[PDB]
Design a protein around this ligand. Structure first.
Ligand SMILES: Nc1nc2c(ncn2[C@@H]2O[C@H](CO)[C@@H](OP(=O)(O)O)[C@H]2O)c(=O)[nH]1
Ligand SMILES: Nc1nc2c(ncn2[C@@H]2O[C@H](CO)[C@@H](OP(=O)(O)O)[C@H]2O)c(=O)[nH]1
Ligand SMILES: Nc1nc2c(ncn2[C@@H]2O[C@H](CO)[C@@H](OP(=O)(O)O)[C@H]2O)c(=O)[nH]1
Ligand SMILES: Nc1nc2c(ncn2[C@@H]2O[C@H](CO)[C@@H](OP(=O)(O)O)[C@H]2O)c(=O)[nH]1
Ligand SMILES: Nc1nc2c(ncn2[C@@H]2O[C@H](CO)[C@@H](OP(=O)(O)O)[C@H]2O)c(=O)[nH]1
Ligand SMILES: Nc1nc2c(ncn2[C@@H]2O[C@H](CO)[C@@H](OP(=O)(O)O)[C@H]2O)c(=O)[nH]1
Ligand SMILES: [Cl-]
Ligand SMILES: [Cl-]
Ligand SMILES: [Cl-]
Ligand SMILES: [Cl-]
Ligand SMILES: [Cl-]
Ligand SMILES: [Cl-]
Ligand SMILES: [Cl-]
Ligand SMILES: [Cl-]
Ligand SMILES: [Cl-]
Ligand SMILES: [Cl-]
Ligand SMILES: [Cl-]
Ligand SMILES: [Cl-]
Ligand SMILES: [Cl-]
Ligand SMILES: [Cl-]
Ligand SMILES: [Cl-]
Lengths: 138, 137, 136, 129, 136, 129, 138, 137, 136, 129, 137, 138
């Protein structure tokens, strides 16, 4: 297989957001969390409270330059189905993915030597013009 | 259908007074870092009527445009649009539906605040001593 | 006249550096100074006895974008002669000039509404590969 | 001779890393992807092989120039994943914030080292796929 | 006229803060500045281009006790308008005012025989619960 | 809702302690007398449960406001010697010197923790008498 | 039993002083000693050079507030007799006592987490007006 | 029997020149921390005769008043009492036997020095620019 | 007149110290101030309200050798009276004076081409053996 | 009494050392050559025996004055290689740079200690020849 | 045989303009530390002809004189010697072959650079405000 | 035996230099090397690449004052021959030697508590007037 890029275009302004929050080992201050707008979704995600994220969603942080980091992903079939069914951009999710962070995003990941303590997905809702904005594409 | 178009950098002209967009978030992390965006260069200061308020004329909306960048979307009432276009040093740049792009660092901040806007304002900043000489040059 | 750009190329790796230290009105004690590498010079800029860079310079910060700022300057006739004779890049200095700050450096000027409290000159030396680097 | 850039493409996602860490009188910079760990002889130290010079390259950006002795160069070029990127005369670019930090320190480096960073759980799969 | 007290209640938890940074004549390099949280404001106090707080203010430290000191101030007409329009507490600012330093803060003014070297304004932001706190 | 004060009376001489320690970008504050040690689950950390906000409350004094997640609140209220003092929204007052320190740091907290402090030789006798 | 407060009023100005000096674990600089004027005495204390203070006098430092500490005491009968016989205020000493320190006094005790390294009593003499002052009560 | 009475805070009047009591201890810990006590507000500066000295007019005595607080006790000769009362902005506050209270921090310092006074003085401090306007207001 | 030497002996171990803090034009943010123990005094030098040491002093750094520098000063009449009445060493202060910097202290003045940005006065206390030491 | 200088001649090349180390609110000063290591009783600490006072002695140089309790004095005088150099009242001189450092700290010492430094490979031969 | 004689400290006269010798090394360690040596006090500024250069008039050579100290040896052309002697406040101190001694700290620096001179110059420094009053006194 | 001083006078200006470089344990920054001009030599030193310096040349750093250090030396017969034959000052080298460093030289040695990591001899060549200078003695 290969690891396919999850590109920026899966973020569609005005649609609720799925956010991947990452905390690194030795992080003390919370403004050190790496928060990544991950996917725009038609409705918020809800996983079976029984199931854990760690069993359906593996992440891995690697260096990609002198101040860049990439995030690599393993996504279980059942979550890929769920995510593909929520995603506003049409079915962008594959089993093996990655996305590139910019230099600003990468600062704390480089400092913790890519050592991850905890991660999660969080549903982030929309602002006052959200419907208008998504309705307004050219 | 209308379109959301970009208020680009060219609308800031060096030497002219500045209209500054100031946004505060609800649960923004890190202290003493503000979101101050020079918004539009103006020939004369903005002055809204005393009884009416800004949020009757001006609505904003911060959303993500990708895995790192964030845009402020906004809707501008017809009255403030005429006023702002008439004051604007750049020729009539203002439209009813727009956005401006945040930079890499500002995006990070807005993301960290979960895009959650507590308030915002528009403030007049004057010019330094060489201002007159800079615009007339 | 026109305000002509003092561009990045007048900083040449391996030569001592002329630097502009700026303090903005407001902010916090925690705030570092804004420190702008300004000109690569043959040798340290020495001012006449009892003088300061404020005595030959006049600066004015103006926005140039949604997160960008330029610094505009007016440079006195004698300092103009001085900096043109120390400059590594051939005679880059004019009386009316500006330089463009990046989106990091502008952050500090914008939150102070462009208002400078003070500035002064600093001279910076070169490390152990300096001459080697400029030769290459 | 000329100081050639050690470009970002010497970093290969999936393989272990050499982190350049620098204390100005602090920054971490991934430096080189390697096939095996670096470990100098017991009775030498990095500064026997490696000189660092931090230098301004514009009105905001800063480069780190460095000179690599021949023994460290043949060693690093053998361990490197990317094929023989290392030369005697080189530089690398710091970002907007690293630069500022460097400027604030008047470019004075107090110390520096090279540290082996192992890889994540998908590491071997990323590079092998 | 009378010197009216700018009391503690004009600092309101959860709002940005206006601060007065004072340097006293004498003392030591080790001495921290005297930093007095002065006014809670809607937004940061921005001064007109090229101006400083010294240009609108006049301060005078006098003892008020065996280990107590007050700061007296005379506030210029335009800054008076400005601070009364940013104030969170409703219009607390008068032209002639004083504030009472505590027995810790007075220690620093008394050992300098009340003599100020300089002062300037600082603006301080709010943490992650700021708006939450002011709402409650 | 309202931020209620965590008063001094939650400190009971004789019983072990929870020390709030805070590093501004340093102060120790006895925080809560507890019957048994606090120890969070292995895979969480304090800042998952606990937000701190330092704020000026006059011309000299400073308070620390904080928000406590429900799990940490039920946990702390069970261990507490004083009966259920802990709420979701609270503050505590710093002294004249702590305040100054806080002001000098522009109220910026770099880190904070909660540490178990055992008791002295008369500890059990003090509380039991 | 209970632990009885040794109140300020046992300090009678103009009379020599008994001082309790406390040093904490990890104290480096001597201006970190906690010195407490403990009792006013008619004459200086002198314990049998044979006997140790630690056998007749136990101390214990506890928290009492967010920046307050209290000192708790166990006083052997023989020292209580001795102290009661020296004390200017009439017989204030009991077997189980405590006194409250203010916030200023408590700073280094809070920093060492109440961990005591060493303590002692010291006789502190009087100034030039001492007799006049003690003679002058209203 | 006489009594030792308190020289209270009210005898310091803002806007008037200050008579400052300065005490040095023998083995005081911590450097650059002085014991400077503003002592009495005066209409005109104090000036003792050149030949005579302060310790012929003024005697001080630092003692503890409890487990934390410390008082400076003092005895003031009849000549300096007349002089000080005549100079005092507050109406005749000075008596022959007095004390003033030290604060929590100063007590700690005096305790740490074992109350052991090396020397002391009385020094005139002037007024700032608003002084005149503050007392006549 | 002549510039008379303020010699080392006017610093007397065990007494508070009067110090001159100097900032030179140029250099680096990293540069410590040049701090010269200047006079041992009975008590702290207190200046009149609103005044600074620059208001009574005039200084001029000149070289005295291949790595040596002296500081020359002109001292105003009232400050002359003040420092002569606080001096521990009997009346050492004249209107025109100089003091000799050592090869370490001159290093800092020479690299700035003798050019001072500012100076101010500092007062330094004494440790726990101070009076003991001066008595001995 | 008088504060007498602890001169350089109390340092005897070849014999182990007592290093005076001082942290201003950092300097190492060889202090005394000793025949055997110093080790205080378990329940005491240096500052019980030893007071330090840093003081300016000219327009550039600084001395460290110190007072040595009688027990530490008899102990140090027995271990000393040079014969009984130690008195109750003493001082030592700092160099041009140590001084500057001391001045920069407003002479404020945060801590100080005495550390045993063993000897080199020729140590015993140097002193015995 | 000629001799290399010392340019001693006496040739620097306080109150007069300074001729400063500035030396840069090739691989000198430590940043922002320069080798600036005040070289000779002069009545008027030095000004070499525009076409000719310093290294045609002036040659320097840094060597060790022992286990710690280092001397700068130099050779001075006949033209610059006449010029420098005529400008020199001190009476004719310059000869064709000389040296000056470096101090303990400067020696260390020169040693660390392996004595390896990259370039050097002579620069005029003026006088402070009391200059006139200092030399005429 | 005794340890004989290797005095400054063995440095003869204008003649190439032999330099003893010393690095101390815990030295991080290279401007912390102690470099000592050791001997002036008629030609550069060249030891049999087979042989090590450590077998022919032992060094030892000792304290000699509150800010002074001395370096003590053991020099094998074969290197003494070699050094004596190179040395410009006539035959100054003995088996047991020492030299005194000044206070400036001693700073980093005192900081590392005299603990040596590595040392070596390095040949340092001469400047543009070197021959003239050595020819010019009075
Ligand atoms: N995404 C977004 N949310 C905003 C904005 N302004 C206020 N908010 C609030 O922040 C929340 C998302 O972080 C939204 O509430 P809701 O998501 O709970 O409906 C929304 O009401 C904005 O400009 N963008
Ligand atoms: N590079 C990398 N390391 C990780 C990640 N998550 C956890 N780690 C841990 O951090 C270490 C690298 O800093 C690895 O251990 P290892 O180096 O002992 O193999 C690994 O266990 C990740 O996403 N990327
Ligand atoms: N709280 C307290 N602890 C003390 C005191 N004296 C010594 N200690 C020691 O300090 C520790 C608390 O900081 C205790 O150990 P423990 O916590 O392992 O029981 C105790 O042994 C004291 O007076 N009070
Ligand atoms: N208690 C006290 N002692 C003083 C004072 N001034 C000087 N001293 C000296 O300090 C000592 C007590 O610390 C006293 O000596 P004595 O106690 O040895 O008799 C006393 O002489 C003072 O004001 N109060
Ligand atoms: N004093 C000294 N110690 C050295 C030297 N070289 C190495 N050392 C080591 O440093 C230590 C002293 O700091 C010694 O160990 P030791 O103290 O355990 O005997 C010794 O092994 C030297 O030249 N002088
Ligand atoms: N010793 C010395 N070397 C110098 C000087 N100026 C330049 N150099 C160069 O430094 C080198 C010695 O460190 C010399 O080259 P070389 O020794 O390779 O011949 C020499 O050319 C100087 O003034 N003294
Ligand atoms: Cl995609
Ligand atoms: Cl667009
Ligand atoms: Cl544009
Ligand atoms: Cl360019
Ligand atoms: Cl300047
Ligand atoms: Cl109030
Ligand atoms: Cl200001
Ligand atoms: Cl009682
Ligand atoms: Cl009373
Ligand atoms: Cl009162
Ligand atoms: Cl002298
Ligand atoms: Cl001043
Ligand atoms: Cl000579
Ligand atoms: Cl001379
Ligand atoms: Cl010899």
């Amino acid at each position: 297989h290969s690891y396919v890029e999850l590109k920026d275009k899966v973020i569609v302004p005005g649609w609720p957001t799925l956010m991947l929050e990452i905390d690194f080992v030795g992080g003390t201050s919370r403004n050190q969390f790496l928060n990544i707008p991950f996917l725009s979704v038609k409705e918020p995600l809800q996983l079976p409270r029984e199931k854990k994220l760690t069993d359906y969603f593996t992440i891995d942080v690697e260096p990609a330059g002198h101040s860049l980091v990439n995030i690599y992903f393993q996504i279980d079939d059942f979550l890929l189905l769920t995510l593909n069914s929520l995603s506003v951009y049409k079915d962008p999710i594959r089993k093996y993915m990655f996305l590139r962070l910019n230099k600003e995003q990468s600062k704390w990941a480089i400092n913790a030597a890519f050592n991850v303590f905890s991660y999660r997905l969080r549903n982030i809702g929309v602002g006052p013009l959200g419907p208008d904005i998504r309705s307004s594409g050219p």
